[PDB]
Amino acid sequence: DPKYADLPGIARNEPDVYETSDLP
Amino acid sequence: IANQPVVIDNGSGVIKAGFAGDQIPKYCFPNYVGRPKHVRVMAGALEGDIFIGPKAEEHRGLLSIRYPMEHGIVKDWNDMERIWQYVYSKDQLQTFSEEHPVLLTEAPLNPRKNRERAAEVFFETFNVPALFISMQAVLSLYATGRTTGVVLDSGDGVTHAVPIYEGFAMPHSIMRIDIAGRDVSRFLRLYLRKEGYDFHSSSEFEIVKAIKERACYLSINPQKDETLETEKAQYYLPDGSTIEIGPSRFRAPELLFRPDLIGEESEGIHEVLVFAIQKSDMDLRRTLFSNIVLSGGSTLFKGFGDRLLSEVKKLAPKDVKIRISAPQERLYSTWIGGSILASLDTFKKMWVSKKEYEEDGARSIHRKTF
Amino acid sequence: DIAALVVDNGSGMCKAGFAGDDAPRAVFPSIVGRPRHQGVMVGMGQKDSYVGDEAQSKRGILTLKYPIEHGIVTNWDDMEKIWHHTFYNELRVAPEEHPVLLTEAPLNPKANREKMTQIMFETFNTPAMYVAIQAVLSLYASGRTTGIVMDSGDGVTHTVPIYEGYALPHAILRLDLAGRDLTDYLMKILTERGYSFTTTAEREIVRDIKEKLCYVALDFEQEMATAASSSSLEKSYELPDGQVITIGNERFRCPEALFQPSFLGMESCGIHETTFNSIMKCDVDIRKDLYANTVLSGGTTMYPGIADRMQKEITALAPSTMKIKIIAPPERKYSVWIGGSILASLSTFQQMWISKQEYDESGPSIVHRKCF
Amino acid sequence: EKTAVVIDLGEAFTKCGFAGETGPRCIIPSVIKKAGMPKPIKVVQYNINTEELYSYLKEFIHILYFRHLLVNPRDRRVVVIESVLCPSHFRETLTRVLFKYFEVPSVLLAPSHLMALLTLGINSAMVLDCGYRESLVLPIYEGIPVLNCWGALPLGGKALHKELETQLLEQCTVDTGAAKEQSLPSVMGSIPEGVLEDIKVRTCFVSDLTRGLKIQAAKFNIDGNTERPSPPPNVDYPLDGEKILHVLGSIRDSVVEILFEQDNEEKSVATLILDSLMQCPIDTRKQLAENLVIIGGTSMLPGFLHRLLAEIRYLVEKPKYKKTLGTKTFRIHTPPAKANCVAWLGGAIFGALQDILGSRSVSKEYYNQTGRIPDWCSL
Numbered sequence A: 001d002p003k004y005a006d007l008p009g010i011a012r013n014e015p016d017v018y019e020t021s022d023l024p
Numbered sequence B: 001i002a003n004q005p006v007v008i009d010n011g012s013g014v015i016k017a018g019f020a021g022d023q024i025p026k027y028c029f030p031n032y033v034g035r036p037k038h039v040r041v042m043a044g045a046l047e048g049d050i051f052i053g054p055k056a057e058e059h060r061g062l063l064s065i066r067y068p069m070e071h072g073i074v075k076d077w078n079d080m081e082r083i084w085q086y087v088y089s090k091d092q093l094q095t096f097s098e099e100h101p102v103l104l105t106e107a108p109l110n111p112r113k114n115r116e117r118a119a120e121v122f123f124e125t126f127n128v129p130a131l132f133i134s135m136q137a138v139l140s141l142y143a144t145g146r147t148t149g150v151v152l153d154s155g156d157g158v159t160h161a162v163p164i165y166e167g168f169a170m171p172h173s174i175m176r177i178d179i180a181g182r183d184v185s186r187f188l189r190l191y192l193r194k195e196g197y198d199f200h201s202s203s204e205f206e207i208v209k210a211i212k213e214r215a216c217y218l219s220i221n222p223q224k225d226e227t228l229e230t231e232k233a234q235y236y237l238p239d240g241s242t243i244e245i246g247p248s249r250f251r252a253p254e255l256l257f258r259p260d261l262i263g264e265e266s267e268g269i270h271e272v273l274v275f276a277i278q279k280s281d282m283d284l285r286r287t288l289f290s291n292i293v294l295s296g297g298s299t300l301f302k303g304f305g306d307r308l309l310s311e312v313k314k315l316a317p318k319d320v321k322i323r324i325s326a327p328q329e330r331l332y333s334t335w336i337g338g339s340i341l342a343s344l345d346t347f348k349k350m351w352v353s354k355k356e357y358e359e360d361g362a363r364s365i366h367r368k369t370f
Numbered sequence C: 001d002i003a004a005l006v007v008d009n010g011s012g013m014c015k016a017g018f019a020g021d022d023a024p025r026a027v028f029p030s031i032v033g034r035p036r037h038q039g040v041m042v043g044m045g046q047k048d049s050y051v052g053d054e055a056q057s058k059r060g061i062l063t064l065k066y067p068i069e070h071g072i073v074t075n076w077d078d079m080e081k082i083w084h085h086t087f088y089n090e091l092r093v094a095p096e097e098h099p100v101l102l103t104e105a106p107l108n109p110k111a112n113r114e115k116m117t118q119i120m121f122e123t124f125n126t127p128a129m130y131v132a133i134q135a136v137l138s139l140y141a142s143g144r145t146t147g148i149v150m151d152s153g154d155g156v157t158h159t160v161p162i163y164e165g166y167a168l169p170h171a172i173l174r175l176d177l178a179g180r181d182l183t184d185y186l187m188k189i190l191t192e193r194g195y196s197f198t199t200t201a202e203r204e205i206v207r208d209i210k211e212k213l214c215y216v217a218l219d220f221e222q223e224m225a226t227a228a229s230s231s232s233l234e235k236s237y238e239l240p241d242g243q244v245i246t247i248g249n250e251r252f253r254c255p256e257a258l259f260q261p262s263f264l265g266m267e268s269c270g271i272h273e274t275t276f277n278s279i280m281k282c283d284v285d286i287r288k289d290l291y292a293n294t295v296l297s298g299g300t301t302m303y304p305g306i307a308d309r310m311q312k313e314i315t316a317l318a319p320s321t322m323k324i325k326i327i328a329p330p331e332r333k334y335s336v337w338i339g340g341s342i343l344a345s346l347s348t349f350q351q352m353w354i355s356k357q358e359y360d361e362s363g364p365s366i367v368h369r370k371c372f
Numbered sequence D: 001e002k003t004a005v006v007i008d009l010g011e012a013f014t015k016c017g018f019a020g021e022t023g024p025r026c027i028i029p030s031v032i033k034k035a036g037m038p039k040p041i042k043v044v045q046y047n048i049n050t051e052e053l054y055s056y057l058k059e060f061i062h063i064l065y066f067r068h069l070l071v072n073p074r075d076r077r078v079v080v081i082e083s084v085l086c087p088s089h090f091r092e093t094l095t096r097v098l099f100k101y102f103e104v105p106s107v108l109l110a111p112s113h114l115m116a117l118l119t120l121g122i123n124s125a126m127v128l129d130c131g132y133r134e135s136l137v138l139p140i141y142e143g144i145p146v147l148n149c150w151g152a153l154p155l156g157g158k159a160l161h162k163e164l165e166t167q168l169l170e171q172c173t174v175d176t177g178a179a180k181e182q183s184l185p186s187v188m189g190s191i192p193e194g195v196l197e198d199i200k201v202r203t204c205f206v207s208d209l210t211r212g213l214k215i216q217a218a219k220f221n222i223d224g225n226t227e228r229p230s231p232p233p234n235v236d237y238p239l240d241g242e243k244i245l246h247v248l249g250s251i252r253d254s255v256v257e258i259l260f261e262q263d264n265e266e267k268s269v270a271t272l273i274l275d276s277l278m279q280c281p282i283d284t285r286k287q288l289a290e291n292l293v294i295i296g297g298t299s300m301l302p303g304f305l306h307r308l309l310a311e312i313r314y315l316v317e318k319p320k321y322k323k324t325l326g327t328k329t330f331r332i333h334t335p336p337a338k339a340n341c342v343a344w345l346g347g348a349i350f351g352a353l354q355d356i357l358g359s360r361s362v363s364k365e366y367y368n369q370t371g372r373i374p375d376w377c378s379l
């Protein structure tokens, strides 16, 4: 994680996965 | 040559240069040339005439900007040559070009003459030992570390979707449209003119781009948001004055998904993604829905993931899993993948040697890619 | 004598005329164009949707949709608009006064023909109508009763063998590669060359380039080598603006997808292999006759040198003793219509109509019992 | 049905009249004289609080409806000509003034460029409006304004007046007449807008293409030796009675060159049309190139159209436009009305179309029910 701390455009405070609800 | 290869992700808006060893692009700057706005013949004005990188950001008010690349195609080849020489400057990489092999990145389905001239420039003006040109969509999967997925690279200039299954690319399933970050910036300029704010100058294109980056979100329900009274978020200009952006905040990026509002004959980002998935063979499609990888700056829009998920849900078959794997590092995913590729020993067998280019001629760079 | 209309609803181009005529009276592209801009105020003299040549002239602002895709009507409202334009505006005739002999490709969905009959009888109220296989009509136009018709138009390429008037439904072979696919491949290779065409309006420009410049190479590799080693094959085309664009090897790579579908990504046989397979599916006794009466039809078979290439390929595939003879009449683009006119001018055809009485009695499904 | 009134508001001038008329009945500066303040206030102001704009528009429209148009406002429909991409808040404030206060039946917010197209009888052209605030190019193709290929630059009458004021204050030579018969530069700190406008319209003119290029080159004068063309004679413009400002000859032809000067950005009044045209759809170019319509007060300056067409043909040959717009035949239209009121004449032609005007316009009942005026932004 901190290895990308210095880059300008790293969008944080967001989830990394947008997915539909699992179904059995 | 055993020296560390140099990876130069060639963005239409922002180029990212570094060495293959590094985990991140140590160097990166906008892809434009800034000249003095007035035709300077007297002394004491902005000397040099060519401002590239943070220098252009220092005196950005006084410069006229000119991008060399438009829609992922190099237009001003002198400006692009200047840009690449500036990459090998004392400011960036502090190195000679003749020492290190180079890995370029180019948009898919681009003109052959663009790649041919890029190779000629990199082999003639710079005495580079070797060269290799990759597509960014292939590199995004390298960066993510997965073997399969649908890469939706929405850069500054070009927005393209590419499905790959187990390292096999579907050339006929690739989708590509020219609605991208710069077009969203132009539409934001138009909507801000509708707000009553003028950004006529090419330099002012940079600050309207900054407004796009700072305060612009994609609403799941644009009609409800438009009906709802907007907060009129306040933004600070470089000079000091404030501006109330207003509902334009959610109207400019909406053209990425629904360009036809402004009369643009384009598919839309969700449309190209879904059609790239559907054009592939049927058995793969479910897996292609289960591995969607975002890339490029335009995917960093606030609420972009939710709206894209909604659109893909209402377009995809019912009760089908969707996974829009949106890594936080998606802006620099392409360069990171290029670095990972160049680190591999297999890259030694991929780039074309200088003698190979001299002997085989142009067609080598066309054939060694595939 | 009340002349019966003949309306060949091609996938790309709609043709229409009266039975007994030599050529179609109206020939216009089968497109429905709609204005692209919505928010801004619209001018004075405007239509909600444009049809046919009116959409073609005003294609700069309009966005075009083809109602028929791969020979299957996907937008029935647009196809109804096309028929209305064909009858009232172009032909200038009341549809209720004359029968109509429509055409459809083989092996299409049954619902397509059923909806065709329903639209003709309910919306337009024609006194009778008929649906005919395009290949049979094109064989009628050539003045033959035995032969194999490889009819290849904007949407589909279908091969139909016929012997002494007796069709062979089990030997018919249909391919989705025709026309529009070649236009898209031409767009792709043009994009590689440098000229980017993306909008639907530019599809018409690319189609015009395909019609004007492209040709079939007798030997593909030799022509590719000649293009690489020389600029004799380069030819210049002028866009509507005035820009001049040079086309090189792409002249003979776009139609080469007819004989090599692997360029388009489809794992299907070429048109020569499809024709040979269709012939070989027939009985052994009649195959020779088919080899002597291969008939090219449709508009996409108008490339220069396609007859020679097809003859060479079939001769390579077929046994040496059999004599191959590809028949490519100069007017073959309209051969599907002309035979239809002949089929509508015959006296014995008055019993083959689907009268409105029969349609009311049995419903649309009668189209499957009468036509084919 | 009673004839619908037509209004075209602008920063410099407002054009008002009745539909189906050969020309506007009234054309006046867009100002209102509030008591106690010497210099009147501009009616059409963007980026101000809505109450002040509401009051200004109320007073000005009352003046229009009871000083120039001698008729009630409630009886007759309205055809308001507003330029495309007009500021939204000004537009809903104007419609609110028209509906809530005056209770007009319906207002048609027609676009200026399409109306200007209607006057000629053609249905496709590249309409350039050289307004006071800014110059704006918009292509129309078959009654469909192509908003995607819009263009604009701030080279209207405002920038020209500012340049004139700067040049006059630099080369100021005014005979005060009170023991100051000699030149007395910058006796007044700032010239009023009216004097600058009168000097611009009366004295200044647009020079030929070759003369303009030579003037632009001689402005730098890098290793130049009297390369400028010989200027016109100076003109002694009277100010305030006694004062006599000796407007120099060079200003009269050099002040307007800011419109056509490139300045290392490839942006000018002439280049604006080419930039818009190169963005148009491939099929629409030729019909848009052969049909050019110029409107706006700045276009009425003497010799403007000749210089514009010459500059268009000159810039076409440059490498940026040579490939695409090289072999093109540009031709200017000559609409029946003067370029000040071509847009008004279009609105007047649209006004007499009584049957459609009811449906196209927004009824006051609809506005009361909703309160939302239609716009080409998302709804």
Ligand SMILES: Nc1ncnc2c1ncn2[C@@H]1O[C@H](COP(=O)(O)OP(=O)(O)OP(=O)(O)O)[C@@H](O)[C@H]1O
Pocket: D009, D010, D011, D012, D013, D014, D083, D130, D131, D132, D133, D134, D156, D157, D158, D197, D200, D201, D295, D296, D297, D298, D299, D300, D301, D340
């Ligand atoms: N007859 C004329 N001759 C020359 N210049 C004129 C004439 N009438 C007006 N102008 C100038 O033209 C400019 C005004 O143009 P115009 O009347 O078309 O603008 P407007 O409608 O008031 O403004 P906008 O369109 O920006 O809202 C001012 O510079 C004015 O001085």
Ligand SMILES: Nc1ncnc2c1ncn2[C@@H]1O[C@H](COP(=O)(O)OP(=O)(O)O)[C@@H](O)[C@H]1O
Pocket: A009, A011, B009, B010, B011, B012, B013, B014, B015, B136, B153, B154, B155, B156, B157, B158, B181, B182, B209, B212, B213, B214, B296, B297, B298, B300, B301, B302, B331
């Ligand atoms: N947080 C953000 N919000 C909106 N747009 C952004 C954001 N960050 C970057 N962008 C846009 O992304 C673009 C950069 O795209 P890039 O990844 O350089 O494309 P390429 O593949 O050509 O390199 C910029 O033009 C910028 O406007």
Ligand SMILES: Nc1ncnc2c1ncn2[C@@H]1O[C@H](COP(=O)(O)OP(=O)(O)O)[C@@H](O)[C@H]1O
Pocket: C008, C009, C010, C011, C012, C013, C014, C152, C153, C154, C155, C156, C179, C180, C207, C210, C211, C212, C298, C299, C300, C301, C302, C303, C304, C333, C336
């Ligand atoms: N002279 C020509 N050369 C090459 N191709 C042609 C020529 N004329 C027509 N075509 C092609 O044929 C197609 C039209 O075929 P057509 O006979 O109308 O089929 P259908 O009747 O199914 O519409 C067009 O897409 C066009 O590209």
Ligand SMILES: [Mg+2]
Pocket: B009, B010, B011, B136, B155, B296, B334
């Ligand atoms: Mg990139």
Ligand SMILES: [Mg+2]
Pocket: C010, C134, C152, C153, C154, C298, C299, C336
């Ligand atoms: Mg046909």
Ligand SMILES: [Mg+2]
Pocket: D010, D129, D130, D131, D132, D295, D296, D297, D343
């Ligand atoms: Mg005006």
